[PDB]
Design an enzyme around this catalytic site. Sequence first.
Site, short mmCIF file in Angstrom:
data_model
loop_
_atom_site.label_atom_id
_atom_site.label_comp_id
_atom_site.label_asym_id
_atom_site.label_seq_id
_atom_site.Cartn_x
_atom_site.Cartn_y
_atom_site.Cartn_z
N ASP B 25 -0.66 1.65 -3.48
CA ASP B 25 -0.60 1.95 -2.05
C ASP B 25 0.69 1.56 -1.32
OD1 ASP B 25 -1.30 2.44 0.64
OD2 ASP B 25 -3.39 2.01 0.17
N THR B 26 1.58 2.52 -1.11
CA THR B 26 2.82 2.24 -0.41
C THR B 26 2.60 1.88 1.06
OG1 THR B 26 3.20 4.60 0.07
CG2 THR B 26 4.16 3.70 -1.94
N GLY B 27 1.45 2.26 1.61
CA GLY B 27 1.16 1.93 2.99
C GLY B 27 0.60 0.52 3.20
C1 LIG Z 1 -10.52 8.69 2.71
O1 LIG Z 1 -9.99 7.36 2.67
C2 LIG Z 1 -8.60 7.19 2.79
O2 LIG Z 1 -7.79 7.68 2.01
N1 LIG Z 1 -8.35 6.42 3.85
C3 LIG Z 1 -7.01 6.02 4.30
C4 LIG Z 1 -7.12 4.56 3.90
O3 LIG Z 1 -7.42 3.70 4.75
N2 LIG Z 1 -6.89 4.25 2.61
N3 LIG Z 1 -6.99 2.82 2.08
C5 LIG Z 1 -5.66 2.41 1.75
C6 LIG Z 1 -5.10 1.51 2.85
C7 LIG Z 1 -4.31 2.28 3.94
C8 LIG Z 1 -3.40 1.42 4.85
O4 LIG Z 1 -2.17 1.38 4.14
C9 LIG Z 1 -3.13 2.15 6.21
C10 LIG Z 1 -2.30 1.31 7.21
C11 LIG Z 1 -0.92 0.98 6.97
C12 LIG Z 1 -0.19 0.18 7.91
C13 LIG Z 1 -0.84 -0.31 9.08
C14 LIG Z 1 -2.21 0.02 9.34
C15 LIG Z 1 -2.95 0.82 8.41
C16 LIG Z 1 -3.90 -0.01 5.18
O5 LIG Z 1 -5.05 -0.22 5.59
N4 LIG Z 1 -2.98 -0.99 5.03
C17 LIG Z 1 -3.28 -2.43 5.34
C18 LIG Z 1 -3.50 -3.29 4.14
C19 LIG Z 1 -4.22 -3.05 2.92
C20 LIG Z 1 -4.25 -4.11 1.92
C21 LIG Z 1 -3.56 -5.37 2.18
C22 LIG Z 1 -2.84 -5.59 3.42
C23 LIG Z 1 -2.82 -4.52 4.39
C24 LIG Z 1 -2.15 -4.49 5.76
C25 LIG Z 1 -2.02 -2.97 6.05
O6 LIG Z 1 -0.80 -2.55 5.41
C26 LIG Z 1 -7.82 2.86 0.90
C27 LIG Z 1 -9.22 3.43 1.19
C28 LIG Z 1 -9.92 2.98 2.36
C29 LIG Z 1 -11.21 3.50 2.66
C30 LIG Z 1 -11.79 4.48 1.80
BR1 LIG Z 1 -13.46 5.14 2.24
C31 LIG Z 1 -11.10 4.94 0.63
C32 LIG Z 1 -9.80 4.41 0.32
C33 LIG Z 1 -6.67 6.53 5.74
C34 LIG Z 1 -6.63 8.06 5.75
C35 LIG Z 1 -7.73 6.11 6.75
C36 LIG Z 1 -5.29 6.09 6.22
#
Ligand SMILES: COC(=O)N[C@H](C(=O)NN(CCC[C@@](O)(Cc1ccccc1)C(=O)N[C@H]1c2ccccc2C[C@H]1O)Cc1ccc(Br)cc1)C(C)(C)C
Lengths: 99, 99
Positions: B25-27
């Site tokens: 996850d690059t995000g």
């Molecule tokens: C359909 O589902 C999806 O694809 N949903 C996505 C999603 O949330 N994917 N998840 C990845 C995490 C996404 C994210 O990078 C966004 C983000 C980035 C920067 C600021 C705020 C938010 C994040 O939350 N980052 C935080 C983080 C994670 C771990 C450790 C530290 C931190 C701080 C942030 O960087 C995984 C996942 C979640 C729910 C489900 Br059911 C399946 C899969 C969508 C479309 C909503 C962005």
Amino acid sequence: PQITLWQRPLVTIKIGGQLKEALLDTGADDTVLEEMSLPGRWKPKMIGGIGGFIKVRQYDQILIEICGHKAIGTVLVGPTPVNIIGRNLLTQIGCTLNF
Amino acid sequence: PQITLWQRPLVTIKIGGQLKEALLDTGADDTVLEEMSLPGRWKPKMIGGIGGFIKVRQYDQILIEICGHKAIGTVLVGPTPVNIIGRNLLTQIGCTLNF
Ligand SMILES: COC(=O)N[C@H](C(=O)NN(CCC[C@@](O)(Cc1ccccc1)C(=O)N[C@H]1c2ccccc2C[C@H]1O)Cc1ccc(Br)cc1)C(C)(C)C
């Protein structure tokens, strides 16, 4: 170009005539942006992330430009903390993970 | 290797001698895994995502293999929807985005 991950991979996108900063997110299925207006029809959708689900508006066949690369796809609009470019659009610009 | 994004970039990781599936996850700034046992003491941390924040346990200097590439860094453990490999470890394996 090649983008390192030392810092969040933020890029400028052009959508609906507006310029915005977004995060290239390989862990995101969809693309979701903060509240904004978009043309055409839309339908409600619930998307989940770490923390739970949020309700967004889904607009299909929306033109977008990421770093000069044009693409078209579904864009979600809602209470997201940051603008996120998901895989549905990353594929269109030929983006890949490499290591 | 070069990973396209037509499907979720799910890879096999190894931690505590066990194999698990995780999302590159690059995000994500950090790495958070579903509930599991890890050695040593932990510190509290709040991580924010799309649906808000969640409390997790922070373990430092943890050995973890990602797609065969060895890394040693901070691993968070908590009620995450999926195992997420964030930039803190993606940078250790030399991952970059390209298009
Ligand atoms: C359909 O589902 C999806 O694809 N949903 C996505 C999603 O949330 N994917 N998840 C990845 C995490 C996404 C994210 O990078 C966004 C983000 C980035 C920067 C600021 C705020 C938010 C994040 O939350 N980052 C935080 C983080 C994670 C771990 C450790 C530290 C931190 C701080 C942030 O960087 C995984 C996942 C979640 C729910 C489900 Br059911 C399946 C899969 C969508 C479309 C909503 C962005």
